[PDB]
Amino acid sequence: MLKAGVHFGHQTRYWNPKMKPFIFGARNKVHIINLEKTVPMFNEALAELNKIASRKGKILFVGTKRAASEAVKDAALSCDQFFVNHRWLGGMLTNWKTVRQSIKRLKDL
RNA sequence: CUGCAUGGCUGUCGUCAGCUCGUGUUGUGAAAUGUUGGGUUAAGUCCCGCAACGAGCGCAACCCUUAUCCUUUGUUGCCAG
């Protein structure tokens, strides 16, 4: 059991064959995801994430695709949150030894 | 005396636009990318666009000279009021 929203899809011939073990078939000329084989994955995700949050762990939200570049920063305003929504460019995490100076370099401005 | 032994100095290209690094990326690695591409120039310039983002030196401005004006000042020079 998992509730899922209404599907219409887009790009009727475009899919990645690395998703094959999680594709249920095709309906309305788009390939569709399996919403039963993914339930033990969703039921783990809500629990292992709440465990990191219960250890005060810093959760970083990502939405660089323009469809999500507002949703990532507009889903809450009564909570505190960390987000990235502009191009990663030289990188952020493997390049954190630069970002830790980029924030100081910004705060002087 | 030895620069075919050396710290350097000067000559060459040439005031040419280039040499190199931090971290990310590519490559088995020696190495590359960044520094390319597309507009535009004296110019790795100035922009746009990107697996790059910034940075040191050279480029360039600041700096020196001057056109026309403004402003201060002096002798045994100038002399209007």
Give the per-residue SS3 of A66-87.
CCCCCHHHHCCCCCCCEEECCC
Instruction: Map residue A65 onto helix, strand or coil.
Output: coil
Query: Chain B: nucleotides under 7 Å from a protein CB?
Result: 22-25, 51-53
φ, ψ dihedrals at A101, nearest 5° = -95, -35
User: Cα–Cα distance between A23 and A17 in angstroms, integer?
Assistant: 9
Method: cryo-EM
Instruction: List residues with CB under 7 Å of strand B.
Output: A 87, 89-91, 94-95, 97-98
Separation of A101 CA and B81 C1' (Å): 67
Which nucleotide has the least CA–C1' distance to A92?
B24
Question: A7, A25 in Cβ contact below 8 A?
Answer: no
Q: Which two tokens stand for residue A71?
A: 């949703």
Question: A84, A64 in Cβ contact below 8 A?
Answer: yes
φ, ψ dihedrals at A27, nearest 5° = -145, 135
Question: A83, A61 in Cβ contact below 8 A?
Answer: yes
